[PDB]
Structures are given as structure tokens and as C-alpha cells.
Amino acid sequence: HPAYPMPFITTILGGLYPSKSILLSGTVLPSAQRFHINLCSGNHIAFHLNPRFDENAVVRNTQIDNSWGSEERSLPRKMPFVRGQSFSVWILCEAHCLKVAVDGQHLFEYYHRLRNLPTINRLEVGGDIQLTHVQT
Numbered sequence: 001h002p003a004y005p006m007p008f009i010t011t012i013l014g015g016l017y018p019s020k021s022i023l024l025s026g027t028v029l030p031s032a033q034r035f036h037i038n039l040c041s042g043n044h045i046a047f048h049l050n051p052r053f054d055e056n057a058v059v060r061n062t063q064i065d066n067s068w069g070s071e072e073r074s075l076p077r078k079m080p081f082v083r084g085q086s087f088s089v090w091i092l093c094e095a096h097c098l099k100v101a102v103d104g105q106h107l108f109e110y111y112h113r114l115r116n117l118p119t120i121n122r123l124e125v126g127g128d129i130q131l132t133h134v135q136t
């Protein structure tokens with residue numbers, strides 16, 4: 001299984017809605033600094049998932065009108081992403097929040113800030129990973 005171009009951008013026809021799943025698989029580069037997965041709406045970023053190896057954290061935020069909101073960094077366990085290690089991310093959309101799992105295990109919830117779900121119809125992946133598969 002080869003790799004996707006990076007950054008990878010694709011429309012999510014029909015946008016989001018409860019029960020909608022977006023799956024991604026790949027491998028973190030050996031000396032990755034950071035990588036991100038964005039769910040966008042027009043010129044806004046409804047959900048920014050940003051694992052950071054320099055900061056050993058997983059940052060989540062929303063960018064509306066070019067303004068980043070309050071970051072969410074809480075984690076129930078140790079940073080699951082590891083340099084040079086393969087991973088899978090499952091983003092499940094629900095009515096009030098996005099539920100995110102990493103390597104088959106729930107990691108966190110992110111309450112919707114941009115609530116018009118159908119308008120969130122673009123996926124962007126960028127950063128220090130080798131993207132091997134996407135399921136929208």
C-alpha cells in the first residue's frame with residue numbers, strides 16, 4: 001500500500017451528520033514534529049486535530065474568521081502517537097460532539113463549535129506522517 005500525496009485534501013460529499021465516520025491510517029515519520037487532520041467548512045476549520053511530538057501533546061481547536069479558539073489538550077492517558085509508529089484515527093460524528101479514537105481505543109470527545117454539520121465538507125491532512133489510507 002503506497003502513500004497519499006501530502007498534504008491531502010478532499011471533499012466530504014454531504015458533509016457531516018450523526019453516525020458519520022472518517023477513518024485515517026498512516027505512519028508517523030521517524031522525526032516528526034507535528035501533523036494535523038482538519039475538518040473544514042469554507043474558509044473555516046471546524047475541527048483541527050494536531051498531534052505534537054515536540055510538545056508531546058494532542059491539540060484540538062477550531063478556527064473561525066481566522067481566529068483560533070481555546071485549545072483542548074486534556075488526555076485520559078499517555079500520548080498515543082509515537083514517532084515511526086503506524087496508527088489509525090477514527091473520527092465519529094455525533095449530534096453534539098465528535099468522538100475520536102486512536103489505534104482502536106476512544107481517546108477524547110470534542111463538542112461541536114461549528115454546529116451546521118452538513119457544511120463541514122472538506123478534509124485536510126498535513127504534516128509529518130505518511131498517509132496510507134482514508135475512508136470518508
Ligand SMILES: CC(=O)N[C@H]1[C@H](O[C@H]2[C@@H](O)[C@H](O)[C@@H](CO)O[C@@H]2O)O[C@H](CO)[C@@H](O[C@@H]2O[C@H](CO)[C@H](O)[C@H](O)[C@H]2O)[C@@H]1O
Binds near residue numbers: 068
Ligand atoms: C501553549 C499554547 O497555548 N500554545 C499556543 C500558542 O500560545 C502562545 C500564548 O498565547 C500562550 O499564552 C503561551 C503559553 O505558554 O504560549 C504561546 O506563547 O499560540 C500559538 C499560536 O496561536 C499556538 O499554535 C497554533 O495552534 C493552532 C491550534 O490551536 C494550530 O495548531 C496552529 O498551527 C499553531 O500555530 C500554540 O498552540
Ligand code: NI
Binds near residue numbers: 133134135
Ligand atoms: Ni480505500
